[PDB]
Amino acid sequence: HPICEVSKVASHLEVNCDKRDLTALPPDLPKDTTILHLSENLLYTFSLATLMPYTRLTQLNLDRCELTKLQVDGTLPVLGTLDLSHNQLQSLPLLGQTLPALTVLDVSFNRLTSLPLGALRGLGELQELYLKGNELKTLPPGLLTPTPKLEKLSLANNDLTELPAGLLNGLENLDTLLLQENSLYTIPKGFFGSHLLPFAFLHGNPWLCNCEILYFRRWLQDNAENVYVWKQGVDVKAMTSNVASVQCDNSDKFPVYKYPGKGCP
């Protein structure tokens, strides 16, 4: 191709069109393309149907562009990875009927102010879902019923005021839960269930330490080594085990995991 870089690596054909000042999908991309990078281009709009010709596409990156609109047409039956992070989308696209095999979805840092009921219907193979950095205040009930195989979920840095008591039901494979930097003040009783959760980030929240936070506290003590802190820096992204990061009023003056609750039954 005279625009993007093509390089076959074993049974994979990778096409890189990163930062090429592209305003639209380049024509005549190799027919066997399995991985396409369109990140950091000038795409204000995009239509999935235009990719139907590539019956081999499995990964598609449309991150860091100027997307204000995404058309969900036709079907890319073999696509399992879609990165839509860092765009100007005002709503979550409904992909269940157009992207059946999807396993990874990233729509972080967009302009999502809510998530629609039945938003993930049909996405039964979804394993990872990143919605970090948007403006979500609450989540609709049954959001993850359709995605039972979910392994990683991120809702970090939104403006969530509460979580549905049954949010994590059925997710017997969840290993990473990022809920840091929101506006949570209490965890519904029985929220975590009995399932083991390798990584859970809960800091950056206004935990209201009162009788109702007791369920959370007992959970914290039993899971002190699964509660992590996520730190970001210049070229570095760290995960550190530290239960004390979860704190009352969000102040390090008092960890939630060591809250007495004098007279709470």
Binding site: S7, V9, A10, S11, H12, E14, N16, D18, H37, Q127, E151, K152, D175, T176, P198, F199, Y228, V229, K231, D235, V236, K237, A238, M239, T240, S241, N242
Partner: protein, 198 residues
């Protein structure tokens, strides 16, 4: 010198404990850079990743990061010295298993984690060591321990060689021995990963 092109995903795990001086750490990072050139990360054959670990895990380069060689060598060279009291090998491994090799978008290339260790984490933190090491195995990830100095967790190095046959370890008296048996370390990786074209 020993070089080679092969289908590989190599993950560098660096001990961030005070068992190594800042200056010694600078030697460890220099070793990582040389390694990157020896395996030729310049080709799409090899994917590299770099994580520093003390109490937590600090990733400066991810496998699917798409940056040119010169940029990666820089990052690697800029990895910060922690000089921490604790360097949990069980944490970094748990991290490697769940956050790095969770899936297998390349069942063709070899998956190798080079765990450069110079310390011994407190026993109370090693409750799930074998569990995590075993997990890496189930996902076709070969763990190569590189004990550096007298304070390398020898019990864990043994326990790693044991969990899998291809899990061969190297023991160096100091970071200076790094560039010594480098060819030996590279040679073993070229014998573990499938071939790529030069």
């Amino acid at each position: 010198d020993f070089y080679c092109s092969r289908l590989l995903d190599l993950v560098f795990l660096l001990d961030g404990s005070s068992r190594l001086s800042e200056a010694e750490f600078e030697v460890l990072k220099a070793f990582v850079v040389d390694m990157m050139e020896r395996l030729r990360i310049s080709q799409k054959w090899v994917r590299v990743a770099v994580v520093e670990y003390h109490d937590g895990s600090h990733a400066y380069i991810g496998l699917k990061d798409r940056k040119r060689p010169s940029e990666l060598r820089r990052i690697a060279s800029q990895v910060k010295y922690a000089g921490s009291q604790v360097a949990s090998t069980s944490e970094v491994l748990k991290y490697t298993l769940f956050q790095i090799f969770s899936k297998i978008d390349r069942p063709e290339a070899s998956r190798i984690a080079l765990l450069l260790m110079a310390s011994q984490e407190p026993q109370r933190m090693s409750r799930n060591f074998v569990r995590y090491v075993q997990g890496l195995k189930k996902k076709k990830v070969i763990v190569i321990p590189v004990g550096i100095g007298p304070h390398a967790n020898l019990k864990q190095i043994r326990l790693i060689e044991k969990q899998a046959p291809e899990n061969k370890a190297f023991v160096l008296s100091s970071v200076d021995e790094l560039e010594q048996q480098r060819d030996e370390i590279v040679s073993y990786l070229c014998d573990l990963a499938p071939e790529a074209p030069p």
